[PDB]
Structure formats: structure tokens, C-alpha cells
Symmetry: D2
């Protein structure tokens, strides 16, 4: 099967699986898992932060992050198209009692500080209390301008707002920046990391920040049901991932750059390509048609007027060459 729907579809490697069946464990609720504790310490260490907390999914990572930054009645300025605003069913509001304030992102995927400023609420009882600024790095594959990251940090310190970055794909961003994770993590109060997507873990995400902050996050994770027991067997894949699956995202980047090339030259209307994603304007009259085609041929994609193809460790250039072929076929 050729799965191009998302990078979430990545399956454990032999080496990753061996690391899991071997890793030592304990009861994480009790704080006994050595492997879970080593993954937390590692990550915090790597980003220049005090602590880290392992989570079931990136969704919870974000739900807990927001609950930890904002109190009942506070607000977070976020993207109109951000995951922790749109793709998490409004958990922040529904469950967290936090007021979401969405605004459109600029083309490069950043949230214009000028527009952000206009949304910060006066200290007036008619308004929700603006507390946090939430960014998403590698927003739909888009890499935020490094310098932007620094401005957003300075801007929030001046206005006493917290800055949180949803880094479900922050490593695709580090590889593209060609820098140290620390170099960018230094410009945010807290951030997340998904291990189950490009990094290739079966499950898992991390929440990184200061100790006190992460201390509240533990409570919120417990209430939301994310505190597992012998989770070390899962965190084992997580360390393996961090230590061996990061550089290789460059291969995924190269592959989607290659794919865009094939399709452009194959008639396809390539709208853009960023890191490990590329978009094609398929049209409405073919959205479902192209999906069927590709599916009948063991190629999975999410059919729609604008199709998002995503690369990861479970799809080669050979496999891409085939999708290219079929796509060209379809158009003829």
C-alpha cells in the first residue's frame, strides 16, 4: 500500500520495535518508569528547558498545554486554521473554559504581530482576559521565518503574554533551518513535539516547558486521562526516534520536492511544496474520481478539490514514481 494521506500512518521499524521490547519500565503514575523519565529528561535537555511530560497524543499535549497556561475565563490568540483551535473539537473551550480568539495567518504561516496586537483585550469586564499566544511551527508544512520566531517572543514578553508553539512537526522545521532545536525552542515558553508522525513512533507526544508549569500539566494530564502505567515501552520508541529518525526527515523533504517536480511536469496544478507536503488543485469534478482511481491502485490519498500529499519513512521515491505515473494517467 502507498499511504500519502498523512505522516501519522508511519509504522514502527525493526530497530524501533526491538528497543520497545527491551526497555525497562515501571508505573508512570507512581513515577517509576525509567524509560518514560529518560525520554522526558532527554527532550527537556535537548531544547534547553526544565521539564518534559509524555502524552498519549499531540491533541492532549495541546489540551493540557492550554489548560496549564489559561485559567477559566482567559483567552488564547491562535490561528483560524491552527490545530489546537480547529482540529481539536474546541476542547479548550468545551472542556477548558478558555476563550479562543482566532485570526488568519499570513501566507508564510505566521500570525501577524500587528493583528495579534489588535486582539489583545483591554482590562475591561466586557472582555475575556488575553493570556496566551499559540503558534504552530511547520503550519501545514510551512516553516515560520526563524526571525519571526524571535519577534513573537520579544513581542509577548513586552505584553506579558505566554508564548506556546505547537510543534507537532517542529523537527521538520529544525532540519529545514539546519540549526539546533535549542536555537528556536529558546523563543517560546512551552512547546510540543509529536513522535508518532514523521519521527515514526506508534504513539506519543511531548510537552516541554519550565518545571512549575509542567507540574500543573501533570495534574491536567491526569484529569484528562493521559496518565498511563507501564508507558515506558512506548517512550522507548520515542527516544529511539529522537536519536535516529530526525536527520532523515531531509529525505522526506527531498522526496516531496521531487514529487512536486514530477506532477508539475505532468500537467498537475501544484499550488505549493513545503518540507514534507505538497498541494495540488485537483478540482471538484475529480476530487472523488482521483481518489477512487488511486485507491483502486493501492494508493491512498484524501480526495478533495485541493489534495495534500504527505511524505514520511514509509514511502520511497520508487513508490512516488508510481503515484506520479498513475496521476499522469488519470489526467489523460
Amino acid at each position: 500500500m502507498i499511504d500519502l494521506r498523512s505522516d501519522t500512518v508511519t509504522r514502527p521499524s525493526r530497530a524501533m520495535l526491538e528497543a520497545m521490547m527491551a526497555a525497562p519500565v515501571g508505573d508512570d503514575v507512581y513515577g517509576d518508569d525509567p524509560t518514560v523519565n529518560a525520554l522526558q529528561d532527554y527532550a527537556a535537555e535537548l531544547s534547553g528547558k526544565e521539564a518534559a511530560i509524555f502524552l498519549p497524543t499531540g491533541t492532549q499535549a495541546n489540551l493540557v498545554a492550554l489548560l496549564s497556561h489559561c485559567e477559566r475565563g482567559e483567552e488564547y490568540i491562535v490561528g483560524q486554521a491552527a490545530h489546537n483551535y480547529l482540529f481539536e473539537a474546541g476542547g479548550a473551550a468545551v472542556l477548558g473554559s478558555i476563550q479562543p480568539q482566532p485570526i488568519d495567518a499570513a501566507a508564510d504561516g505566521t500570525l501577524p504581530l500587528d493583528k495579534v496586537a489588535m486582539k489583545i483585550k483591554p482590562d475591561d469586564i466586557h472582555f475575556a482576559r488575553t493570556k496566551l499566544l499559540s503558534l504552530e511551527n511547520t503550519h501545514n508544512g510551512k516553516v515560520l521565518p526563524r526571525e519571526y520566531l524571535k519577534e513573537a517572543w520579544e513581542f509577548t514578553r513586552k505584553r506579558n503574554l505566554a508564548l506556546h508553539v505547537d510543534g507537532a512537526r517542529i523537527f521538520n522545521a529544525v532540519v529545514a533551518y539546519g540549526c539546533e532545536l535549542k536555537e528556536i525552542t529558546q523563543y517560546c515558553d512551552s512547546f510540543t513535539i509529536c513522535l508518532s508522525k514523521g519521527l515514526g513512533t506508534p504513539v506519543g507526544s511531548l510537552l516541554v516547558g519550565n518545571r512549575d508549569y509542567i507540574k500543573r500539566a501533570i495534574r491536567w494530564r491526569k484529569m484528562t486521562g493521559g496518565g498511563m502505567r507501564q508507558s515506558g515501552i512506548l517512550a522507548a520508541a520515542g527516544m529511539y526516534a529522537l536519536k535516529n529518525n530526525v536527520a532523515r526527515l531531509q529525505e522526506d523533504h527531498d522526496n516531496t520536492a521531487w514529487m512536486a517536480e514530477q506532477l508539475r511536469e505532468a500537467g498537475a496544478d501544484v499550488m505549493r511544496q513545503d518540507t514534507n507536503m505538497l498541494f495540488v488543485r485537483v478540482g471538484e469534478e475529480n476530487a472523488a474520481a482521483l481518489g477512487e482511481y488511486m485507491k483502486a491502485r493501492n494508493v491512498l490519498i484524501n480526495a478533495s478539490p485541493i489534495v495534500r500529499l504527505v511524505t514520511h519513512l514509509d514511502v520511497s521515491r520508487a513508490q512516488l514514481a508510481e503515484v506520479a505515473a498513475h496521476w499522469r494517467a488519470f489526467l489523460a
Copy 2:
């Protein structure tokens, strides 16, 4: 002194007070207040709706309407600048567990239906469940196009969405249209009426809609603490207003257009005026000095880079004339 911060400042007239002191009361929680019952019945019948409920304020009116329409986890599409998203401290989200989907209204005060449609969430566990479309007639003075009021209603029926209209100033819209309330209210499942502003009442709002819908509103009204006792006395002022202070709203609208032309001649930069409101481009430099200047001369106005002047029954043209004079001499 001259109050132009808002029409919420209007005070009870002699005749209105007499109606209040003479009103027959009961215990509204038991449902024994005849005058409260009367106000609610009049309003319902007047708009072609089955029921109506009396609330302490317009804010609770909307809070109760949004809770009555949306379940925990449902979402409402609303204006980024609409009172029930922005000016109510995020109550829908915070207190009701409802996900808000704000979008920018068009220049005429309408929420573009093409934009609304794009914000309607697919039936996917990743999204909040879109359930209601909230409108506001007379949005910052702006009277919504009547034809709009019909497409909106049609649009929501075709897409199984409730439609609620925040009518704090719905009568300024009605007086402006030159039609009966029924003609525009026929186009909504539920709407709201504010008695404490233009209509001169000291307190009070009405939430109007279907019988079964208003029945839930009572539970939510009790809970949010708005179920009062011998409130018929307050409801009394509502009857007096609905029957005597609707027509003269026209007096407010004329006093506003005339003031817009006077501030122009005085060199001030009038940005626009709609019904009982106008906004002047003051600037960050004079913003705070101007409110001070006006306050020292007995003119209360909400000082701000852009100044909104609101006219109502406690502010005459003579008084307005003097404000034009002060404004002119302030620019010297």
C-alpha cells in the same frame, strides 16, 4: 450633564415610573407575576413567536439563548465584533462549553454567507459541531439589509442551522426599515429585545422564540441567576416603552445625522453615522485630551482614537449643538 457614551444611560420618565409604581406583581419564579407575563405575551404576539422570557440584561439574554441552542461541544458562527462573542467575556465558551467561530462581518454589518458556509464544520470528530448562526441587527448602528435577513434565514434552513438575532437595538432597525417587527422576525428561530437602551427602560431584555426553546431558556435563566421575584415592576417599564418609545427612535436618528453634519463643519472627521450612532476619527494624540476637554465641560464621551457618539432620549439637539461648539473650539 450631556451623556453620549451610550443609549444605555437613558433614565425612567415620569410616565414610565408611574406605570412602574402602579404595576401588579407576583412571584415570577412561581410564575405569579401578571405584569411580567403580560410583557412576555405582548412581545411574543408582536413578533409572531410562541413565547418570550424576561431577563435582567441583554448579556444574560444572549448567554441564555446560546445555551438553549447549543449543546456542550456544539459551535456557533458569529461576528468577530459581535456583542455575543466579544463583549460578553467569552461566556458562551467559558460558562457554556460552546465553541465560538467568529468571522469578520462585511462593511454593511452582515456576515457573508459564503464565508459562513466555509466555516461550517464537516461531521468529523476533529471538529466542533456547528449548530447556530448568530446575527446582530443594528450592528454598531448599522442596519442590516432586509434582503440579507431573508437569505440568512433561507441559508440556515437549507443547512439545518438555528439562526438567532441579537436585537439589542432591533427597533432602531425596525423604525429604520419602516415595517412591523414581524416582517423581519419571521426570519429567525429566536431573537432578543433590549429595553434598557434606546427604549428608555431602567433594566431588562427579552429573549423570544419557540415554546419548547423558551422552556429550556427558563432552566438556563434560573441557573445563571436571572430568575427574579416581584419583577413585574421592571416589566411594567417594558410595556410602557414598547408602546410609547418606539416611534421617537426616529428623533434619535435625525439628531445623529444632524450632529454628523455639525461635526463636519467644525472640521472634525466623521467616519460614518448609522441610526443613533456616529464615529469620529480623533487620533491617539487627542484621544485622551478630548475626553478630558469634554468632561470638564460636562460632556461625557467614551474617549478613544475613534469616538462613537450615541444619541438617545436624554440628549436633545440643543445639547448636541453645544457639543459641536466645544468640539470646534477643541480643534483650535
Copy 3:
């Protein structure tokens, strides 16, 4: 028309109505209402507290009280039959995301302190964070022992918990104690006052406490929809009542005492008599019968196996003399 259902049915005296009509008013959202300001300033001073806030109802006074005391995730220990746990539809939990921890009260109406200590949750991530102890003075007529009021105050100072008192009928308790209000209010962090019951106003309650605590309350009041405009009309009723209607509460007490004896000798099974209330065991077999019987005689009571009769300024001894006569007849 003898109304014995509750003291909420009390109606405005002539002296009261006149004051109301005369009260100067303003816009309370702007804080421009002299009467409201005057009301809040008297209640605070009379109790030796810093500030006070006027609310539409007692339910909202307690809901705001609880919001201002407990953050999302915190907890309040309370009585199983207490009004802010059982009788406000659980808004504290439903609206404010507060965990309620009820225990049963002793016969005297107090919450056994050894029982409260047993419910104070350990600082562990499995538990909600106990923060406040809520008492109810004059709990179904019952006057809490004064010593217990001090003991509970010392108990909460010791275990660092906030202490709030629902004082809907706190004046019934004060008049029973025979002391000044400040002598018992000095034993709580915040307390409420209902003006619409024994004190007999049409509307109103007050939440009283430290100025910063009350500042949060103002915010919660706006969000819950209790931010009225020209509410000085209602607040004047409040001042009048605190000036003229406190002392007479002794009259309703003596009337209850009287009535209880009568029903006793008439062969009625009077279960308990406290301040302005008395309960009678009537039975499942007479519940309906009695209510109807009394209704045909213009006597309003809440029928049930156990009838609660409440006395107030609108029930004279002479009328009670009638009721006892009918009840006797009823039992014959």
C-alpha cells in the same frame, strides 16, 4: 390572601415604593448609580467588610460567590441540602467547572467539622483541590450555634480554606442571636444577603467581601448577566429594608412560635419550628387534600407529605388564626 409558601412572596410596602420612585439613579456598568453605590457601601460597613456587590438574585450571588472563590479544578465542601449545592441546578459545577463535595449536616444545621476535615483532599493529582467551605446561616429556618461559627472560622484559618456563608436569611439569624451583624460576619470571608425575602424587596441580593475578591465578582457578575443599568431603583428598596425591616423579623418569629402551638393543640403533628418556619407531617394521604382545602379558602401553601409554612411581613397573626382554624377543621 394568606400566602404561606415562602417569604419570597413578600411585597413592597408603600414607604418602600416611594423611596424607589425617588431614588436617584445612573448606569451601574459605569458605576454611575448613587443608590447602588450607597447600598453596597452601607452593607459593607454594617458587616465590617470592605466591599459589596448588588446582584439580581441570591442564586447569582452564590454562583458569583463560588466562581470568585474557586478556580477551575478547585473544590467546595458543602451541605447535601444546601441551596448552593442542591438548589441552583449545580451551576457551580456546570458553569464554573468547580467540584462540589457535599456531606450531610447535623441536626443543628451545621457541617460537622470532623466530617469536613475528612473531606479535605490531600495534595495528590487524583483529587480535586479543596478550597472553600460553604455554610448556610438559617438553614431551613435553623439558626447555627454561634460558637460553631467561630470554630468553623478558626478551622478554616488553620487548614487554609476560604469560608463563605449563604446568608439569604442571615438577618433572621442575627435577630435570633440578639447581636450585631458584624459579630457573626467577622467569622467568614464572604457572605450573601437576600433582600427579597423576609426583608421584603421586589428584587435583590448582595455578596459582601474583601475589595479584591469583590472585584473578581464584578467580572463574574457581568459574564453571568447581572450587570444592570439603572438598578438604583431596586437598590433603594434595599436601603429602606435594611433601615426599617430588620427589627420586625422578630414578629414573624413570634408568629411562627404561636402558630406551631396552635396546630399542635389542633392535633397537628408539628415536626419542627425554627425562626420564621415550621414543618408539619401531613402524609401522602392528605398532601393533596390539604392543599386544595386551603386553596378554596384563599390560603396558599406548598402541599406535600411534609408541609413547610413560612411567615413574613405579609402574614399577620390574625390570618394565622384563620389558618389554624381551618387546619383543625381539616383534621376533623
Copy 4:
């Protein structure tokens, strides 16, 4: 290392680790994981229910169960000492806006049905809407009488209440009953199964019920953050444990009874023994000393004046013999 803290400390056996590694997996959010699907189908049929859903923890299992049964403003009657009320930080009230109505459980572990009846709120606006009755079978080791299980079911059928059973240790009960699971789950609308406790799994729980009920459960599971990706690996242990670690549960019961007799002869005051649990009255004086004394001998226990010792598949009788030996010596 002897661990008697809980049965949550069980770790994977070699056979269970092989199952996990060999398990075919897919993406669970898309519904492509064959092992998760099988785990869920299996539990459904074994219990007589239409659907089942795998969650990361027994807590999320109950939060989602609660949210799926009670809408905003509704309420569940539950045990004062129940896990979904006491040990889950109040998530039901905090996140779900659901009002809890706890009550003391009888000595045998059941919630007196007659007690439950007095807590079902009349349909009146002052009260929250009673919707669900929640039980916990094997409540602190206590096996609820089967007659009770049937009675509660009928009672709830008559009163039209949903009945949910928290079954984190439902197999301990099944084995004590000597009946098939189906014979007890036939008496509830929904129930959970914990895999990571006595059953020996690393992580995981199940929530079983109707297909509609579970469909909403999938929505809440996503918002709360339990929608993992390739969780088939985790779920494989689940099938293994359900097919192999159920009957051996009797051994833990026998060991537990046996140990209790050892500790008695050793001079300890054993208060109670049920299924795989037993309690010792150690005393506030020896609690800390005891925990340490054992710790020094590689025996982990949760010290307290009353020590709960839990037996599981990772503690044999030989080890229990060692432990009683240290205890006899401690006492001396």
C-alpha cells in the same frame, strides 16, 4: 523486588510481549488498526454489547463514559468513595459540566437503592437533571452481590436512568462469581474493563456499550486526547490478557486470603480481605517506620495507618511468605 502497592504494577510476560510485537497495526484515528478493532469486537461479544472502544487509561474511560451519558446540566448519582467521583480530580464537573451526586456506599460496596431514590431530582428548574447511576464492581476488592446487580438494573429501568458500571476490576468479580461476564454486564447499559491492573497489560482500558453511545464516545475520546495512532501494539496485550490472564485471577485471591492468615498469626491486625486485597491496621505510629523497614528489604508498600496490600501476577506466595516474615519481625 516485591511490590504490593497495587496491581497496576503488573508488567508484560514474555508471551504478552511477543503478541504485541507480532500484532498487525494501522492508524486508529482512521480506523485502520486491525488489532484495535479485534480487541474491541471481542469485548463487545463477550459481554453482550453492540460496541467497544479502547482508551489509554481507566480514568479517560470513565470521563468519556460520563460525558457520553450526561449532557451539560445533567447528573449522575455515585459513590462518595467511587473512583469516577473521588479519584479522578472531578473531571466530570470540571471538564464535562456534569453535576455529581455522591452518597455513602453500604458496607458490602453497594449504593443502597433506596438511598439513590431520594437523590433523584424532581423535574423542577432549581435542580440538576438526574441521568445516570454509576456503580463500581469490585469496589476496593468488595464483590457486589449479584442480586444487587439485577436489582439496580430493574430499579433504573423503572426510573428510566442509565446504569454504568466502572469495571476496572470486573474480572476479579467474575472469577469470584463463577459466572460468565455476560451474566453480569446484562445488567448495565455500559461498563469499562481495565487491562493494565490484574490482567497484566502495560496500558489500556475499554468502554463498552451501545453503538450510538460508543459513537459519541469516540468524539469525546478525541477531544480528551485518547485518539492514538498505531495502538494495535498496545491492544494486542489486551487480547492476550483476556484470553490468558483471567482464570489465574483466582490464584491472587487465594494468595490474598492466605497472606491475611499469615499476617494474623504474625501478630498483625488484619481488618478485611476481599478478592486480591486485604487491609492492615498498622497505626499512625508505625506507618512510616513500616514503609521504610520493608523498603530496606526490597518490599514496596504504600505506608499509612491502614495499609492496603494488593496481590497480582507479579507476587507469588513464596514472596508473600518472605513479606509476612519481615512483618512478624517488624512487629517484634
